[PDB]
Design a protein around this ligand. Structure first.
Ligand SMILES: Nc1nc2c(ncn2[C@@H]2O[C@H](COP(=O)(O)OP(=O)(O)OP(=O)(O)O)[C@@H](O)[C@H]2O)c(=O)[nH]1
Ligand SMILES: [Mg+2]
Lengths: 415, 177, 180, 18
């Protein structure tokens, strides 16, 4: 229940503001910057600010803080969801999120803000629906918003019915300094870019453990996602009733389902680091990377980031496979490898000097993270069974899907 | 500057009026007190272009509290726009009527609110519910006298499920206060 | 410079002209404007603000800005006085009590230096009952014959019937346009 | 070709489930 949502700037200037209830004065935005500065300097800065009896909830955007001032005890989660929807709509309409587009599309930006929410209650949240009624280059509102199906616009015609799916896998491993993995969770991502004619109702079917157990086929390799979230077009009733993933696919790229469950398998890449750091004399980087993934899968664009000393200079890299580049801005050395086949063993030996004068304050030990991304690999083993594409007119669809395995929160605690 | 903008707004050229409106909107967003030109834009308010109508409505909403006396020359325009065949125009008029913080403005908008309460368009119904909720928040006594509680309650048991949800949220907000 | 484009535009008609819609409330000003623009007797709510419309006749688009006779809208007629070339006063011959108020409003409107190039335009509204006066009694009561330096003409127009609107439009066009 | 795994055809439903 934010009183007014406004877009700020890096210098405190409000790029654009739009009051929705009028219960909060527009002059409260000026005091938001001093409050944020005081909070940052004291460690008490939070996204939800508080200016007396009015709370100024702000979200750190790409270039401006989306401050949504509120007065009463409005839904904080609702305000955050509205801000996220507004950010997504702006990203869809404008490819750049900065001051260049804030002051360049004000005529359409004001109309979009007015149409999105009224009296603090959001009304329009579909990017396609908003673009079909408000454009920067007006007819009556589309019937899709009024109709029940607000995620599948009717009347869409295409020459070919091709849908491109993406089995995105995020391998996150939380390995402590002792060598044991604490947080090892893999989050699935079933995103399909449906581009067909009409409003087909997708019938999602995969090798789900629950579905296999219900059907009596709980003996093969089935993916048991701890948390499964359906898309907006996905009908929750069918999933709760018999796990039937039946919903109208959206026009374009959208996230249908996103699995999320813990992983009990060995890490895809095993990286062991050795720190032979002398006392203000030199530093040793005994970094050894072992590929725990299958040899048939290659980790393309593998970049194992090893944090080097903050004051370290004149470093020498003695590795075997993969180029090592030291970035002064990042204050770390990334063991970048173009192609990392499974089972490969890469050994590196870093050596650099240190300044004679000791550092005044400590810099910490940031965890070492790798950027391995091996496509065409299904670590979870979940295989899609079928995709029920049904249309009233009747057409032969040719859906496609690709499985991509990447490294997410794969951070290894430093020694 | 100000004189040139006023002269452009007091002209019969649609391109010049649109340029003046865009300049006024840019000045207002940049931090320029354009409330002094609100009476000049009052005459150039009833325009066929929807882009200019939205800018005029936004200027009136942002310049309603600053110049409540000058806002009395927009009740007729709001009444005329409340019966526009285009659902977008009707929704914009309903939103602007509830967004104007005028004590004497909402009194004359009760009839348009009652007319738009039974709007067949789900977007029109949602806009009418939002306007009723805004009027109740601004004046609970006025909302009670207009008898919008019965209309809001019956909106829940109708079609336009998004409009039903908007009406339910409006009723909860009215009951919350 | 060359005026070939102006001559070409004037050969087929380029003049538009202007007009004003003022008078007391319930004097047929809104009805007169609707008849000029549309041509039918449509019932409308009182003009709280103002009505803007244009009528094309004789190749001239004489736009008329209707102004209500309400107390809160009577002082708002000064906003339309800027960039205005014509002024039409709506008389209420059937409202004897409001006749004095209408005459006072007309005198106040005509007593402004800004509204000097607009000739008087008095329409005998409510010309449907026997109580309505003629074209000379109304002018004599309003004192239009003593308004020097103003082209004021008394015309009787009935909103329900529509007769006399053409005569008033022709008189306004003659007062504004003085060409062949 | 495309990085991250080549696109593969998908079926319509579980043919072995009737
Ligand atoms: N029925 C009828 N009404 C007439 C006639 N002549 C004048 N009128 C008046 O014309 C009025 C029409 O009202 P409006 O359309 O609002 O125009 P108006 O007279 O200027 O009134 P306002 O717009 O409120 O200032 C009626 O109220 C009548 O009082 C007539 O011949 N028949
Ligand atoms: Mg009128």
């Amino acid at each position: 229940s934010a009183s007014a949502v406004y877009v700020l700037d890096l210098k405190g200037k409000v790029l654009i503001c739009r009051n929705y209830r009028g219960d909060v004065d527009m002059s409260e935005v000026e005091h938001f910057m001093p409050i944020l500065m005081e909070k940052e300097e004291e460690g008490m800065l939070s996204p939800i600010l508080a200016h007396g009896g009015v709370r100024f909830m702000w979200i750190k955007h790409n270039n401006l803080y989306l401050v949504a001032t509120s007065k009463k005890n409005a839904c904080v989660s609702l305000v955050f969801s509205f801000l996220y929807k507004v950010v997504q709509v702006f990203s869809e309409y404008f490819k750049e999120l900065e001051e260049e587009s804030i002051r360049d599309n004000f005529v359409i930006i004001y109309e979009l803000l007015d149409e999105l929410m009224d009296f603090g209650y959001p009304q329009t949240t579909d990017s396609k629906i908003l673009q079909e009624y408000i454009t920067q280059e007006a007819p009556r509102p589309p019937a899709t918003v009024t109709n029940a199906v607000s995620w599948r616009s009717e009347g869409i015609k295409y020459r070919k019915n091709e849908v491109f799916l993406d089995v995105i896998e995020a391998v996150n491993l939380l390995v402590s300094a002792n060598g044991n993995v604490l947080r090892s969770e893999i989050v699935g991502s079933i995103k399909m870019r449906v581009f067909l004619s009409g409003m087909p109702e997708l019938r999602l079917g995969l090798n789900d453990k629950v579905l296999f157990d219900n059907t009596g086929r709980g003996k093969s390799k089935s993916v048991e996602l701890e948390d499964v979230k359906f898309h907006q077009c996905v009908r929750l009733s069918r999933f709760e009733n018999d796990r039937t993933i039946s919903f109208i696919p959206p026009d374009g790229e959208f996230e249908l389902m996103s699995y999320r469950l813990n992983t009990h398998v060995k890490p895809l890449i095993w990286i062991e680091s050795v720190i032979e750091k002398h006392s203000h004399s030199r530093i040793e980087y005994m970094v050894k990377a072992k590929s725990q993934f299958k040899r048939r899968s290659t980790a393309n664009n593998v970049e194992i980031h090893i944090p080097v000393p903050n004051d370290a200079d004149s470093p020498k890299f003695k590795t075997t496979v993969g180029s090592v580049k030291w970035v002064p801005e990042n204050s770390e050395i990334v063991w970048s490898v173009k192609s990392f086949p499974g089972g490969k063993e890469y050994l590196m030996r870093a050596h650099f000097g240190l300044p004679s004068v000791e550092a005044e304050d400590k810099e910490g030990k940031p965890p070492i993270s790798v950027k391995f991304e091996i496509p065409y690999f299904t670590t979870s083993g979940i295989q899609v069974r079928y995709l029920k594409i049904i249309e009233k007119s009747g057409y032969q669809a040719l859906p496609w899907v690709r499985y991509i395995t990447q490294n997410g929160d794969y951070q290894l605690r430093t020694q | 500057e100000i004189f040139e903008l006023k002269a452009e707004l007091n002209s019969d050229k649609k391109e010049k009026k649109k340029e003046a409106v865009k300049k006024v909107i840019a000045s207002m967003t940049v931090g320029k007190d354009v409330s002094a030109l609100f009476p000049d834009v009052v005459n150039c308010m009833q325009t066929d272009n929807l882009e200019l109508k939205k800018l005029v409505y936004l200027y009136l909403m942002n310049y309603a509290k600053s110049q409540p006396d000058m806002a009395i020359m927009a009740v007729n325009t709001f009444v005329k726009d409340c019966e526009d065949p285009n659902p977008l125009i009707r929704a914009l008029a309903v939103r602007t009527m509830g967004c104007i913080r005028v004590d004497k403005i909402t009194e004359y908008l009760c009839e348009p609110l009652r007319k738009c309460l039974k709007d067949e368009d789900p977007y029109v119904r949602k806009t009418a519910a939002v306007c009723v909720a805004k009027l109740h928040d601004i004046n609970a006594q006025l909302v009670e006298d207009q008898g919008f509680l019965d209309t809001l309650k019956d909106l829940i048991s109708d079609s336009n499920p998004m409009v039903v949800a908007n009406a339910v949220a409006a009723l909860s907000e009215i009951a919350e206060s | 410079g060359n005026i070939f484009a102006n001559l070409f535009k004037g050969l087929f008609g380029k003049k538009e002209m202007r007009i004003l819609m003022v008078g007391l409330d319930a004097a047929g000003k809104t009805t007169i404007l609707y008849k000029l623009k549309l041509g039918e007797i449509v019932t409308t709510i009182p003009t709280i603000g103002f009505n803007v419309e244009t009528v094309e006749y004789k190749n001239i688009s004489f736009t008329v800005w209707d102004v209500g006779g309400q107390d809160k809208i009577r002082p708002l007629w000064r906003h339309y006085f800027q960039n205005t070339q014509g002024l039409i006063f709506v008389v209420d011959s059937n409202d004897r009590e409001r006749v004095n108020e209408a005459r006072e409003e007309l005198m106040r409107m005509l007593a402004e230096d800004e509204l000097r190039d607009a000739v008087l335009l008095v329409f005998a509204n409510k010309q449907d009952l026997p109580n309505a006066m003629n074209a000379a009694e109304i002018t004599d009561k309003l004192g239009l014959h003593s308004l020097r330096h103003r082209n004021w003409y008394i015309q009787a127009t009935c909103a329900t019937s529509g007769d006399g609107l053409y005569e008033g439009l022709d008189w306004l066009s003659n007062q504004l346009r003085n060409q062949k | 070709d495309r990085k991250g795994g080549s696109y593969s055809q998908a079926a319509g439903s579980d043919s072995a489930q009737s």
